[PDB]
Amino acid sequence: HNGEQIKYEHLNVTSSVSDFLTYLNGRFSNMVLGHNGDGINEVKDARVD
Amino acid sequence: HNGEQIKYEHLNVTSSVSDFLTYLNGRFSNMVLGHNGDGINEVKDARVD
Amino acid sequence: MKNSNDRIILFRKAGEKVDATKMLFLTEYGLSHEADTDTEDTMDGSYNTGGSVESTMSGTAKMFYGDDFADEIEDAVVDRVLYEAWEVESRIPGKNGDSAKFKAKYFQGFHNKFELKAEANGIDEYEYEYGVNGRFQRGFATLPEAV
Amino acid sequence: MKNSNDRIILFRKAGEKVDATKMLFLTEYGLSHEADTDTEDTMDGSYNTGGSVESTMSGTAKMFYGDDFADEIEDAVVDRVLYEAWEVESRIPGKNGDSAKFKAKYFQGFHNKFELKAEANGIDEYEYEYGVNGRFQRGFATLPEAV
Amino acid sequence: NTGYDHKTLQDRLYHDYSTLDAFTKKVEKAVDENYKEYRATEYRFEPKE
Amino acid sequence: NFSKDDNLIELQTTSQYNPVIDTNISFYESDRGTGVLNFAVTKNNRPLSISSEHVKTFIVLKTDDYNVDRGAYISDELTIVDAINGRLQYVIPNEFLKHSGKVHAQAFFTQNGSDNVVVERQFSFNIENDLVSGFDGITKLVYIKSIQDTIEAVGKDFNQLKQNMADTQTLIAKVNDSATKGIQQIEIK
Amino acid sequence: VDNFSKDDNLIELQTTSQYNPVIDTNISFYESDRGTGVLNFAVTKNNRPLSISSEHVKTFIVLKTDDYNVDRGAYISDELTIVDAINGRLQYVIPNEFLKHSGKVHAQAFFTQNGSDNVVVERQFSFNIENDLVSGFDGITKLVYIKSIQDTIEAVGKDFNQLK
Amino acid sequence: SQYNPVIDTNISFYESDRGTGVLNFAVTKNNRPLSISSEHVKTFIVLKTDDYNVDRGAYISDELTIVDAINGRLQYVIPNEFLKHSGKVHAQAFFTQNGSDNVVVERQFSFNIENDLVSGFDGITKLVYIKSIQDTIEAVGKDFNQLKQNMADTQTLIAKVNDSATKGIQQIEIKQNEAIQ
């Protein structure tokens, strides 16, 4: 089977495994090599629509 | 199926799902994180979609 | 680190359940396991045959007056009676409830050879070769008379 | 220029991935490669046949109380289990990123023979012959416990 | 929005986005299905039936 | 490129008595800005990911002839490259080379927020002498480049904050100029 | 506990009355970690893990440097911070202090019965900790640099308060 | 649960300094007063008043005065301008032997200095040893990072004041790009 096929069902949530694994890898990559800082200002700016 | 019978291709990176899960678990058990602040890592994790 | 004389070596006939004894005045004792593996060639590669293993042990000892055991051995080699022997290493007791019995190897087979030898003005020495006849089992065994 | 005792020699069963150990108290260790080439004659000339090569290594060592490895060997020769061994020369590290691991030869085969020997008032010595079962690979390998 | 505390905002954003995406995807799937059904019932050039 | 970026040493971040090792790395005296040490960190057997955001890594370096009247020692930061793979490199300084012979090194990491640190190997290292010499840097040099760069960066941050606070008065002029240029571009086309 | 410590040591502390002389553990900490020294003890009765909970036996570990003396040395007894009450997994974080006391350090476990004076004690071990170029190398420059940063903060604070 | 760091080096604070804030410290090396010299050792002291917000900070840093080396005493005369702050002045002393040992003994303490002179010379005094190059940054790292974060807060306030008009620039460019259509 191709990885896009198989379904990963969490609570009330449907998604493949390939997409989920890519999302896990992207999370790891962002948490590691993603620049950070001024989180409070980031949130207070994200408050806008 | 026992995992190894599955394909997983992304960004011209073909591999088996059962191997990629081990790779992710490895990267997670080797990931390092610092107490940058009171939510900096949290927002950095949320930065993906 | 083990002085050879620590190795204790017993024999007895299978039929005589009660009987027990030990070999005395060993000078040189040697065990052996001989694997018969002769690969026969193949076009695509080679295969290593798994053959039988004729294990045997040879010991030489002395022969004194207060013992006839060696005579029992030179009897068995001829009469081809079965025997069973115990290669027990002393100073190595059990682990839980087997302390009185020390580690040993047990194996049953025949005595394949007896050869004694004399030398003017010297004690006569008898050598024996014993074929083990199969797999040698492990465990612990108890000595007689605390020696 | 290499003192023999620099040669370090390890074994382990293929199945037991985690397991690792080393041979101790070697006295004489000898490797061997034996080429079987018997030319059969020809009218116009002669041709040198290229035959198999049954490489094997024989080592003798001593046997003490804080070790049973030699017993595992005398078990394998009988049970004819597979093993794999490492002839690592210490004081010879990698070249780029393999310094912790020193040069070695790796080969997998069976133990073809075990023969121990005793001698009154002396430590018992066990010798072993190991068949390599094919080509011996090269590279570098890491020691355990820094020794 | 469905009343369930998560471990992190990332998990919450993921679940909500996936719910919305599945909803919009189910909607367009139903749309395409109805359109194909109408095209069938209009044209209907299957001699085998 | 021309540089000695071929070497590579692994640092096992494990508590199993990883002893000192002669990495067999012999730069030369007349080598400036081209002596590089490629470190690859490994947690237990596979590479330990890293980042300049969460943690901050430094290395200590000390010649073997280190005395009070003559020696050498430093402690300076790293240059993480391919962090996810647990890889990084260190550009050898220029003043340290003048001191030749054996060298001991070390690489220690500090996790932000907690200041709890980690020390990996305490490995060895070599440096040789060449014929381009004659000047003697006998004066022992000991400078904590980490805290030195810290104070320098704090000063530069204060200065940049001052410049930004000064520019805050120019932002209205920027807005007006941008609006005027937009109106001009509209009236043009 | 975090995913940054060493935590590459699995010690098999078996409650066997037969014999458990000593463990000359192959382990080091380099004296400069001082923030993450983790010991992952296992527990077994004969060959299987134990099932110890908080309501059940409480845990204790005693640490003692090699050369302990009322004037010189180190000795303490603290908790274990149980991880898994099923497989007997006990992760103990070493204090910030002993890692400053270079050299060897012996240790031992201790299990108290929750609700009775009965206790149990496990096999010893010795996790040496070596010296490091980080915990040495000078006895002036550190003071010089702390003084320099103090002067810099005391100075820049004036301009900072001014511009603020 | 006792401790015995093997450096046998301590820097004690005389309780008999209740007058005129003449901080008279003593040194003990192997339970012995260590003879010091200007070159043999080095010293340092930092004092910060109670938690003033930013306005009145008695933040002083100065070396010591060798009153008696052979006896092992170190005097520090409190500046009159400093003791005006009647707030509890936290204090950090640092002594360093430079005897081929990386010992930098630090003493954290405080008292209740009055506008006239040192008063209430109490407070649970602790001591530490800087035996590693990471806490030299962490020794004064607390207030250092505090001021760093204050500077960063002012910087982000300035950045928000600037974005207030950068957003206007964005609105301008977008409205113009829409009008040209």
Short mmCIF file of C-alpha atoms in Angstrom, two decimals, chain D residues 1-4 91:
data_model
loop_
_atom_site.label_atom_id
_atom_site.label_comp_id
_atom_site.label_asym_id
_atom_site.label_seq_id
_atom_site.Cartn_x
_atom_site.Cartn_y
_atom_site.Cartn_z
CA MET D 1 57.42 -4.81 16.00
CA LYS D 2 53.99 -5.75 17.32
CA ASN D 3 54.02 -7.64 20.58
CA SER D 4 51.66 -10.57 20.22
CA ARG D 91 46.92 0.61 18.81
#
